[PDB]
């Protein structure tokens, strides 16, 4: 309460920390009578996934494929309906109110990422298109049909509003730069599934494929390791000065990696697919994963 659903949906999709350490959990019902979704807030992360001990909650019309923070209050959401939703918290952060819900994609919106500025963001859909959004004006600035298949993951550049990555089932990894007349650029194997920029190095990123392999790549011009047995669902760097790379998969296992992609930590705690991971800014050693088993597993990474 207040004005929030009693039962949270089974399949936990997204998990993100903001600066002060409140946990944003997004969820879909991927089976049963009603195929809806929901957005949640946990100022006590240890209380999750218990519904009664949460700060805020709200019902969405359709399921949640991906979400992300917009600074400290806003919540950008990728819907099944073919729409990017923006939800903003109220004054006391008790309610979660919808700011807009623009139906622009023709298929499920799969991936979403906020740009360096914070006034704009980018989405990726099963309709093949990638759209750059203005969050103030609530409109599509540009609409790009670069790929020839479903857009699997898009990842905004950390410090450059123009630059971002995208990957798709057409086997392309596009480096974008909206200042060029032709903004997309093909970098270059099995289909690329997840993307993550290096937080310190602007010219370096990592990508996971569908065959359970994470690879380190420089924009100019290669190291890789067989981490997982199945598809790499997500790649999240830690907040440390020399950061560690968390890697998720459909084999139901977490793996934290070093600079040269060697196995430091392993966890087979989840019984279903591990969907999203996030590092606490209060304690950098902790790591929170969520999965379709409806677990919120708080790990202790040895560093």
């Amino acid at each position: 309460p207040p004005n929030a659903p009693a039962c949270m949906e089974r399949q936990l999709e997204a998990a993100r920390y903001r600066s002060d350490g409140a946990l944003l959990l997004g969820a879909s019902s991927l089976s049963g009578r009603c195929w809806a979704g929901s957005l949640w807030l946990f100022k006590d992360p240890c209380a999750a996934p218990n519904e009664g001990f949460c700060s805020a909650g709200v019902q969405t019309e359709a399921g949640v494929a991906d979400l992300t923070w917009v600074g400290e209050r806003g919540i950008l959401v990728a819907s099944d309906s073919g729409a990017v939703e923006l939800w903003e918290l109220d004054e006391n952060e008790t309610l979660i109110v919808s700011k807009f819900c623009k139906y622009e994609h023709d298929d499920i919106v799969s991936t979403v990422s906020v740009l360096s500025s914070g006034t704009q963001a980018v989405s990726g859909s099963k309709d093949i298109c990638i759209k750059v959004w203005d969050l103030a004006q609530q409109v599509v600035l540009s609409s790009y049909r670069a790929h020839a298949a479903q857009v699997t993951c898009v990842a905004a550049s950390p410090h450059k509003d123009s630059v971002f990555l995208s990957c798709s089932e057409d086997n392309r990894i596009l480096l974008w730069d909206t200042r060029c007349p032709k903004p997309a650029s093909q970098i270059g194997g099995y289909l690329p599934t997840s993307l993550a920029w290096h937080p310190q190095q602007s010219e370096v990123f990592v990508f996971g494929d569908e065959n359970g392999t994470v690879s380190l790549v420089d924009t100019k011009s290669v190291l890789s390791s067989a981490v997982h047995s199945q598809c790499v669902t997500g790649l999240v760097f830690s907040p440390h000065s020399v950061p560690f790379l968390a890697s998720l998969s459909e084999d139901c296992s977490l793996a934290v990696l070093d600079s040269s992609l060697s196995e430091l930590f392993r966890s087979q705690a989840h019984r279903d697919f591990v969907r999203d991971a996030t590092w606490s800014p209060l304690n950098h050693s902790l790591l929170t994963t969520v999965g379709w088993d409806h677990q919120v597993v708080h790990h202790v990474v040895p560093t």
Partner: peptide, 19 residues
């Protein structure tokens, strides 16, 4: 559901409770 991906061979994803 179109995003509800399903494992059949490998444990423990194949032993998912229904429906």
């Amino acid at each position: 559901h179109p995003r509800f991906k399903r494992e059949f061979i490998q444990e423990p994803a194949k032993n998912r409770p229904g429906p």
